[PDB]
Amino acid sequence: HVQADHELFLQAFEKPTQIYRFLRTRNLIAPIFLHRTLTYMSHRNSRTNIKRKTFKVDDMLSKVEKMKGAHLQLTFTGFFHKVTLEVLLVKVCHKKRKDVSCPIRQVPTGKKQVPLNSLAVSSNEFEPSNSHMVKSYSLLFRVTRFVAQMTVFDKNRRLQLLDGEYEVAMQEMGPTLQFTLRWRIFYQFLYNNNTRQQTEARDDLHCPWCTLNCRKLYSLLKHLKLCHSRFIFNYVYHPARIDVSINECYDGSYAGPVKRTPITHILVCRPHNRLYFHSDTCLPLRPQEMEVDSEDEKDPEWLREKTITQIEEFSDVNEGEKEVMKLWNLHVMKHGFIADNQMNHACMLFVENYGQKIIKKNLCRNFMLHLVSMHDFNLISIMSIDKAVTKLREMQQ
Amino acid sequence: EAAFDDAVEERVINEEYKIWKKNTPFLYDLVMTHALEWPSLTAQWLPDVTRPEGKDFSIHRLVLGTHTSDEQNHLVIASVQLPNDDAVSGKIEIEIKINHEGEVNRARYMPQNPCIIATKTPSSDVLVFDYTKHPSKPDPSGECNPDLRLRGHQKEGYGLSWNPNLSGHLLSASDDHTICLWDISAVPKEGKVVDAKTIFTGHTAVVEDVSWHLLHESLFGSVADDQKLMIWDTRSNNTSKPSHSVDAHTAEVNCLSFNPYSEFILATGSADKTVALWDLRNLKLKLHSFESHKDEIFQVQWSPHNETILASSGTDRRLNVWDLSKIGEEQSPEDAEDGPPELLFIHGGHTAKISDFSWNPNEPWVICSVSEDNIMQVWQMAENIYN
Amino acid sequence: RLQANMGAKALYVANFAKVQEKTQILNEEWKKLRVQPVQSMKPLKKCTIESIFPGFASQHMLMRSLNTVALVPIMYSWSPLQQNFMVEQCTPNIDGPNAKSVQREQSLHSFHTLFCRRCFKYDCFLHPFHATPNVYKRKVEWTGAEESLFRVFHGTYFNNFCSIARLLGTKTCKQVFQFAVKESLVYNYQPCDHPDRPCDSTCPCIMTQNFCEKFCQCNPDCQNRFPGCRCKTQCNTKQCPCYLAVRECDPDLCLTCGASEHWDCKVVSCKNCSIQRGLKKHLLLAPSDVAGWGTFIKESVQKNEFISEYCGELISQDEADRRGKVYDKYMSSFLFNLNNDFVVDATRKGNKIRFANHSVNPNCYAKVVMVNGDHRIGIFAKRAIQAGEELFFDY
Amino acid sequence: KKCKYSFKCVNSLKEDHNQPLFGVQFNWHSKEGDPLVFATVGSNRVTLYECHSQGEIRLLQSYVDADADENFYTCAWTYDSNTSHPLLAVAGSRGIIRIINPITMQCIKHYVGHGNAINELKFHPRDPNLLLSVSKDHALRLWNIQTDTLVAIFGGVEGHRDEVLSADYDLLGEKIMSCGMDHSLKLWRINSKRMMNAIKESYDYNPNKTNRPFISQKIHFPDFSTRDIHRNYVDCVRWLGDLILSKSCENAIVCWKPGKMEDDIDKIKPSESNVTILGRFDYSQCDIWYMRFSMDFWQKMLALGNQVGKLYVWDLEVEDPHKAKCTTLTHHKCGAAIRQTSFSRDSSILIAVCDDASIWRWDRL
């Protein structure tokens, strides 16, 4: 398994699975249709229409009428100086016309011993009454053995101080204090009829990418078939086996003031394999001979005939020179050589490939001339030429 | 930046529409996806019906508006073939097409005389047609023949409502801070134009829906874009102060509807992504706020065949329908993951702004819907859902 | 002037005689055969034939269908290729009897002027002219052929008598010694000539914006020459020195990658010298489902993998312009611009990869690579591709 | 000399489709004494026809293909070696070569190897199994129908540089000429050992016995070429013994041979360039493309058409071809262009086609 089809497999299951991973969050936060209302998936629902029979819309107002019929946990902490402490709600009201000083009311909750060098609970005891009378509600912390306040309630019923631990200074008549405010299935993928990957479902029926907890296999199969339509699923009991395949016939289009022509669509009222051809002949290629006899290799005869007739067309060239020229052309075309050092072997192939031809034509002198010619270009050494001609003349004798 | 986002959103909407087209044969008893030549900002079933005893399918009728551009507007009276209890057969047929003055924003048939149909315009002059007098085809010249014109506003709007008890009493709204009320029964037949019988002006914003109370003809209700609902008594001789006025929503209110069975209870749909339930005995307390829609709601209609059912739709491209009897009920966690318990169905078969929808007064749990992208759907949910 | 009318008459009557006897023996051969006659069916469409001449009735006959067949697109003739192409004293034989004396420079004139360095052939189809003759310069009875052989042998050896005595065999060391005693008295690559001078601005290599190579006869201690890569791995990344420029690997210089190994096998480490060795994928022909013909691939290939290489006739810019103007009537423009100097025209000759088409969403791509100075094409994959899939690349 | 031919129009039929015809060929391979038969063809309508002494052209068969857009060009007749039945061979613009067995009246065989339209079909005279096919795709082909495979491709890099219009064997079946729009008259050979043992291996081919493909022996090197005999397009070429007859849009037939007058036909090299214009025949009004001439089996005469209707006839038995007595044939109804003519085995019957769906007949007297 080379990485080519592996990578294409990975991409072809990345893009639809990426689209479905997007659609997962999309239909979670913005569902398209309620899954409870499906006929093949109704176990998710956990109620019936019994209450609709005994319901009465006119009698609903009494229920909300009888419905109309924070948990401040102030925790103290050890002080930072060099005793007991008590919390109090200081309600400062609006100024009435008869009074010149503002109304002030100090409701102490209770005392508690705290170290130096408990808690108090308040279950919605603001007592503002929503009558436009509570201008501010501060939290005073009395101590002995340093007293100070802090604006808790804002003007617009906003909270000033944050939750969690905190600390605040004080002044009798550095030294401070601390407190804490608080308000088994098995997928088998198949692409070009190749078992590219084989896995096993971790969960029993939790979908792999949609992640819905369906307690039935038929509902899971119908969900995988209808939804997530880029794939095609097949099922046979053989531990469960699922056979996945890519659907290469999707309906990808737009599917949608401005004019258009009218239509009336109604759907429900009461429910490698392609042939090939040769290159030069263009005849039909049988499937039996595809890898064997690979065309476009073993370079054609018209190039050889062109190399023949081109150098034969040359005027001021002799007969044996043209003969050894076409022999060298056929040799280098039969075995391509681009490396310079490999040419030292190439001549040693020539006597081993056409030596008997040149003895039958007496072309050894022009062959040595061609050898010296290529030697002039500094392609080969001269002792290699000596070895080659000695090896040729040994077998020639 | 925005164009590519709209493009990929349209691709996702196409994928969701294909998924809906694949999944629809397990949810509905009837489906009929029809596209019109022009869009429709209004759709309403009529009470007439024909039942050939030899054939299995019944015939129903629809009133539909148009919203055109550089073309004559045709108010459509169409027909539809609904299988009753048996049987792939049934098509849409356009019966009558009447030339209309400009586009259409709202259209309502008289419950007393179904032949009389009031319609709005993009100008002040709304009008009223009677198709029995008109011919069965349109005029190619384009000069419309209005049967009963009506004036009194200074701008366009969306609100329109007939009085079910009193004949001729017709309310209409407009965004010029006025609510017109006409009574066409008093004018003779020769008089084709009628002045405003009365105009009410108490709001301080764009009024966007009005409706007569059903079992009490002496008052009506309205909601406006001042975050305000106002119940107006007709007996009072003061056209400024209403009988009740409530800040019933956090944003601009868009639609209202009264119950056919009950008389005091009503529902509203607003632009703060909510439907709300109110009562005509103590309008101070908000009874309940249904929050599943995620955009501006534009229409809500109580069901005629059921009392504890509500509907809503807007530019979210998903028509919601709710059951009031299932309110505040405990359910499974996976059942709650999809949505609240009261939410009965989410018909997300559209691909654009759901412009209008309506119920049929003589068939169970069936509705029609019209969008701006030249789509007109009709469907009835399965029996297994509601039982 | 006109002394062949009677001769033409004689030739014509002779032609009549031999064609008459040819037809006679053909008649004798045909008379042996005995074939059956045609027989029609007893008389859906119809076909009637009238007659302008009266006296003949209108002859009717029911129509008979024929078996349908699969149509294919249009293809003009061509032939395959693997290398590029280009289109724009007697000195008798040494072995023959009429050989005569001739100097070393005149004897090797045709060999040196026809021999080519960059391909090791004679009169190849891409090198029209040789660079210079200074590229090969370096620091008893006796016939004229033997004189020339002794001349070139002593020239290459500089009077090493035992070596000529070994090579010739017939001639001995003493004889050749006694004879020698009485003998004294974005542009295409182009190799330049400046051995005495260094590589400077006047050299055309720097003018072409290309680095020198081994084929140039400049100073070996130069800087403009491109040394080969030194990567032990397959060197198919951007960090390789050869991959910076458009050039490919070198057979001799790139010794670290192991390009100089035996070419008989195919499993090699260097994944860049496939153009030189020619490890191309077995493409196939088919009808494309877009426009006309197309090329399919047999084996799967990877991202930036070697699919094949384009091939065709190298021609000038104006040459390809007039060629495309001529082919505008036929509307078959398989051209592919190579560089400013030369461009490829492959309508008459080429390979299967020509048959790909244009598309907005391609999967392959092309890249120019200077293999040994030859500016060749390389068609690589811009994406993982399966077998039997379409190949597309922008021209 | 006088005309020595008493020709008179015996019949002139007109078909019911009004589409120009493109070819006509007689059943020369039939025996003696049987009822003679020939066949014409339009775009998508081939029609066989009989002939009698009194001009009673009796309709025998008429086939039509399903695809109406196809445009037929030529037809040919052949006999089978084993079954000894007749076989029509047809082709058209779809790139197809069909073989009809008119006894069974079905498409018994079909071959497809071309890219574009077929221009002309021919059959090897001695061995009746081979089948040459000329096409617009700058190349020819040679099929063998007894074994149902291809033999060779008489084209390549050295082939015609334009559309190929016609080709023809010699009478003995050892050398083929080919001509086209590229102003080239190229010779071939089917007598060397390569073509012979290639045909022999084609006869011995069987896909069921062995498992291999056929080794197609291409030919990228004709034995003679020239570009000086004509300037305009060359619509038709034929053999006469060892001499080449050819036409063109220059309104003149030319009779010539390769090389000098003394140069033999069987010893011409590929690099031969010299020619010898032995004779010419003059006529007029042949500017339109795709025009044809024809000869009999004995080749005692020659017939030709023109783009007006007034056909022409020339003799070949008499000496002095350029001083040969011509003959004209006219009528007050042939208001269309003639495309091709033909004779029977003997020189008694002559039939010609035209572009107005008209089929004219002439007979000796």
Ligand SMILES: [Zn+2]
């Ligand atoms: Zn070369």
Ligand SMILES: [Zn+2]
């Ligand atoms: Zn340099």
Ligand SMILES: [Zn+2]
């Ligand atoms: Zn240099």
Ligand SMILES: [Zn+2]
């Ligand atoms: Zn240089």
Ligand SMILES: [Zn+2]
């Ligand atoms: Zn490298």
Ligand SMILES: [Zn+2]
């Ligand atoms: Zn390397």
Ligand SMILES: [Zn+2]
């Ligand atoms: Zn390397």
